[PDB]
Symmetry: C2
Subunit: 151 residues, 2 copies
């Protein structure tokens, strides 16, 4: 059995679709069926905490902030590619959103297992992801726009 995760828009709070997670011999496949997102490539990662709630810093609200940082069980403390080991295991390939706001292209994360995903959050960012902390920390994804908690 695969897993289905419901995704929610952090600004309006409305649902934007689902992501199907599937265990394959080469890793976990993420098949999205999302709508209402801005066209373009978006940073897509697994975050530490199983929460999509916001958090605060200096009295400012941070949407999706409760999810914490990137899933990084080996304590690499660095952002990278989905196919490099010295970086966050939660680093997924960027998610493509078409001109009409639809996300339907599946991507593979070869370092992950479906089992370990439970209890973490799937996050989609405003910006893209160049898979590096240079020139922008965490791939330049920026704000969190949509989030979902796995299982």
């Amino acid at each position: 059995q695969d897993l289905t995760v419901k995704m929610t828009d952090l600004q309006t709070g409305k649902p934007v679709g689902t992501i199907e997670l599937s265990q394959n011999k080469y890793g976990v496949v993420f098949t999205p069926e999302l709508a209402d997102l801005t066209p373009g490539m978006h940073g897509f990662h697994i975050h530490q905490n199983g929460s999509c709630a916001s958090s605060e810093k200096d009295g400012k609200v941070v949407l999706g902030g409760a999810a914490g940082g990137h899933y990084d069980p080996e304590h690499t403390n660095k952002h990278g590619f989905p196919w490099t080991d010295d970086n966050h295991k939660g680093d997924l390939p960027a998610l493509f959103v078409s001109a009409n706001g639809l996300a339907t292209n599946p991507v593979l994360a070869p370092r992950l297992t479906l089992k370990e995903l439970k209890g973490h959050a799937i996050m989609i960012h405003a910006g893209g992801d160049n898979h590096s902390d240079m020139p922008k920390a965490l791939g330049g994804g920026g704000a969190r726009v949509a989030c979902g908690v796995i299982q």
Copy 2:
């Protein structure tokens, strides 16, 4: 060492960029640096023959036709996902082209080895790729728009 492949637009014959091929523990990474392509997702596959020349059928010219069909050394005779074994080993993840005609997002083909790629062609299609022969044969990629021969 990685491999660099030069890509050429089949209609005008001009170069559109390069693709860097790299062997990784999880498969081969294709990092494109292309321009002048139509925005959207494009079918992206490895074809049998090491040629980007055209071919003819019923006296009609078929651009890129000399490359033959999809690389399929196990004779599966079916189009599928980059992470399923019962289909063409030349089936790569779809290539994303931004609003400005640039392709710079890397993708991983976990079933391939850099070694076996030599002598085949990399092809980009007009249409997309749903990784199935349904409802359209070969994922609905259609015409061949850009092509390059590996090594």
